[PDB]
Amino acid sequence: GLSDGEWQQVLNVWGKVEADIAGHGQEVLIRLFTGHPETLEKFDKFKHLKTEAEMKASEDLKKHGTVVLTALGGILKKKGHHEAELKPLAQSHATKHKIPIKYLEFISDAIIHVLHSKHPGDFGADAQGAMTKALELFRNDIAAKYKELGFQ
């Protein structure tokens, strides 16, 4: 698990995200799509986006970035006590959206990248450590639900 101190760091970093939820959400998805174009193919409503300029100008992509980070923020504020919040997300990502766990690794990496990119010098080694742990807890608890479903 994470320590009390580590949770405090995680939720302190998250305060940065909440100052511009849509902006952070959009950059996370753009980083995911551009670094891993196979991921874009999982989204029927975003696969029309051919260039980063189109992605950047998509108001619906910003909207979905808001949905995504609002859900993740809810989970992180549970500090590991997130079974009821996490299970349904795990289940829709495996069963409906067909998202391999690797793509969750990709988006964890993208969040870390975006945090550094948006807050250069304001996302210290201790904070990266804490947030990385939170994100591996998230990914690991989803992977358990994936195994249950036998989903690959």
> How many Cβ atoms from other residues are within 10 Å of residue 77's Cβ?
14
93 is in an annotated binding site: yes
- Under DSSP, is residue 110 helix (H, G, I), strand (E, B) or coil? helix
Distance (Å, rounded) from C-alpha 26 to C-alpha 23? 5
Q: Which two tokens stand for residue 68?
A: 């995504």
81 is in an annotated binding site: no
Least spacing, CB of residue 105 vs ligand HEM, in Å = 8
Discontinuities after residues in the chain (C–N over 2.5 A): none
- Under DSSP, is residue 122 helix (H, G, I), strand (E, B) or coil? coil
Least spacing, CB of residue 88 vs ligand HEM, in Å = 7
Least spacing, CB of residue 111 vs ligand HEM, in Å = 7
Q: Are 22 and 66 in contact (CB under 8 A)?
A: yes
Least spacing, CB of residue 64 vs ligand HEM, in Å = 6
Contact footprint for ligand HEM (CB under 6 A): 39, 42-45, 67-68, 71-72, 89, 92-93, 97, 99, 103-104, 107
Q: Are 27 and 62 in contact (CB under 8 A)?
A: no
C-beta closer to ligand HEM: residue 49 or 68: 68
C-beta closer to ligand HEM: residue 89 or 127: 89
C-beta closer to ligand HEM: residue 5 or 35: 35
The residue with tokens 């959400």 is 25
- Which residues line the annotated binding site for O2? 64
- Which residues line the annotated binding site? 64, 93
- Which residues line the annotated binding site for heme b? 93
